[PDB]
Amino acid sequence: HMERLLDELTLEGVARYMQSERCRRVICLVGAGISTSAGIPDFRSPLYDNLEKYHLPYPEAIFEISYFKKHPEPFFALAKELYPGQFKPTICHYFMRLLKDKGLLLRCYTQNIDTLERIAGLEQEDLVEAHGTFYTSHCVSASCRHEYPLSWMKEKIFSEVTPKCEDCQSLVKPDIVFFGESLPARFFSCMQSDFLKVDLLLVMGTSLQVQPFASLISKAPLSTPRLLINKEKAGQSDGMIMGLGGGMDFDSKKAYRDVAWLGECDQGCLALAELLGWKKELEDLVRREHASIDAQS
Ligand SMILES: NC(=O)c1ccc[n+]([C@@H]2O[C@H](COP(=O)([O-])OP(=O)(O)OC[C@H]3O[C@@H](n4cnc5c(N)ncnc54)[C@H](O)[C@@H]3O)[C@@H](O)[C@H]2O)c1
Ligand SMILES: Cc1cc(C)nc(SCC(=O)Nc2ncc(Cc3cccc4ccccc34)s2)n1
Ligand SMILES: [Zn+2]
């Protein structure tokens, strides 16, 4: 039987393992659930309605790069409607910032496009924005590719002026991955390397149903522990490679490394930080950084 790095399948067992010498390199996989406490909805059933007024040939047209390029106005009107009114990263995001500053964070793979990871102080090298990001935008012409910052894009969105490139007048598109586009190059380079070197996988606020995350959990070594912090269980499996070839196993007789902590991401992170002796550091970090944002309003 495989080496069992967790002494028990609980948050407590994960924390003891994190403090042990073996655990040096943590990868986080994070989705829309880490940003809902920041006032950014995750598009469960509570988006389709906002679409009707745009008179699309079909609803999925809003996500299609092909359709964007000929009829960009629906997308930019939606982006206005959905633009967050403020950008205060959550307790969960700051938990990741603690991981960075303690030298524990190998990588944050995020499905979010809201930039809160960066606002919380994760740097480009810490991040794989698996679904791209609003943080930058580019002219869509292959020979130009001029880059625009978020301040530029925001103004176009709020002014309701379709963003055109100042060099060539082609459309300028936010660097988010529309259906039709390839995942960022950065995604492919990092993943190979990262996932051999990982000691702990921390999966927060994702149902693990969309790409690329849905593959990623099985790329960790087989002994690497995997903690999910989420409102509901996710990533569970119902071929040749047997133990290599499915998902989370939290509840079977054979479960040996995967743990599900059910509830709000912020609360789960606060609970883990508390076990680790980091609760005051985290609370102090959040207060200071939220204050720093509030002082600029
Ligand atoms: N903040 C954002 O950038 C944002 C917001 C909405 C949607 N999206 C896009 O939609 C897709 C969403 O994919 P995903 O896999 O990241 O999310 P998802 O579709 O799996 O939804 C988030 C998951 O977290 C859970 N959840 C919600 N709030 C929670 C909380 N506070 N604590 C714990 N669990 C909570 C939900 O129940 C769900 O399991 C991505 O393409 C993403 O870019 C991004
Ligand atoms: C507009 C804005 C700006 C910033 C900085 N942050 C946010 S977070 C809030 C939010 O849900 N917004 C969104 N904008 C566009 C959305 C749908 C969509 C459509 C088409 C392609 C997509 C490609 C990839 C992902 C989504 C795509 S959801 N929103
Ligand atoms: Zn251009």
Residue numbers in the entry: 54 to 99, 103 to 294, 298 to 356
Give the exact sentences the study uses for this entry.
NAD+-dependent protein deacylases (sirtuins) constitute a unique class of enzymes that are conserved from bacteria to humans. The human isotype Sirtuin 2 (Sirt2) deacetylates both nuclear and cytoplasmatic proteins and thereby functions as a major cell cycle regulator, a determinant of myelination, a regulator of autophagy and a suppressor of brain inflammation. In this work, we present the first crystal structures of Sirt2 in complex with a potent and Sirt2-selective small-molecule inhibitor with drug-like properties.
We solved the structure of Sirt2 in complex with SirReal2 and the cosubstrate NAD+ (structure termed Sirt2–SirReal2–NAD+) as well as in complex with SirReal2 and an acetyl-lysine peptide derived from histone H3 (residues 11–17, structure termed Sirt2–SirReal2-H3). Both Sirt2–SirReal2 crystals belonged to different monoclinic space groups and contained one monomer per asymmetric unit. The position of SirReal2 in the EC-site of Sirt2 is very similar in both structures with either NAD+ or the acetyl-lysine peptide substrate (r.m.s.d. of 0.47 Å), and we will primarily describe the binding of SirReal2 in the presence of NAD+, as this structure likely represents the SirReal2-inhibited form of the enzyme. The aminothiazole SirReal2 occupies this EC-site adjacent to the C-pocket, which is the physiological site for product inhibition by the feedback inhibitor NCA30. The naphthyl moiety of SirReal2 protrudes into the substrate channel and the dimethylmercaptopyrimidine substituent (DMP) induces the formation of a binding pocket beyond the EC-site. The naphthyl moiety of SirReal2 that protrudes into the acetyl-lysine-binding site is in van-der-Waals contacts with the NCA moiety of NAD+, Phe131, Leu134, Ile169, Ile232, Val233 and Phe234. In the selectivity pocket, the DMP moiety forms π–π-stacking interactions with Tyr139 and Phe190 in the selectivity pocket that is shaped by Ile93, Ala135, Leu138, Pro140, Phe143, Leu206 and Ile213. In addition, Pro94 hydrogen bonds via a structural water molecule (W40) to the carbonyl-O of SirReal2. NAD+ of Sirt2–SirReal2–NAD+ also adopts a kinked conformation with a similar network of hydrophilic and hydrophobic interactions as observed for NAD+ or Carba-NAD+ in ternary sirtuin complexes (PDB-ID 2H4F34, Sir2Tm-Ac-Lys-p53-peptide-NAD+, PDB-ID 4FVT23, Sirt3-Carba-NAD+-Ac-Lys-ACS-peptide). The binding mode of NAD+ in Sirt2–SirReal2–NAD+ therefore shares a higher resemblance to the conformation of NAD+ in the ternary complex with Sir2Tm.
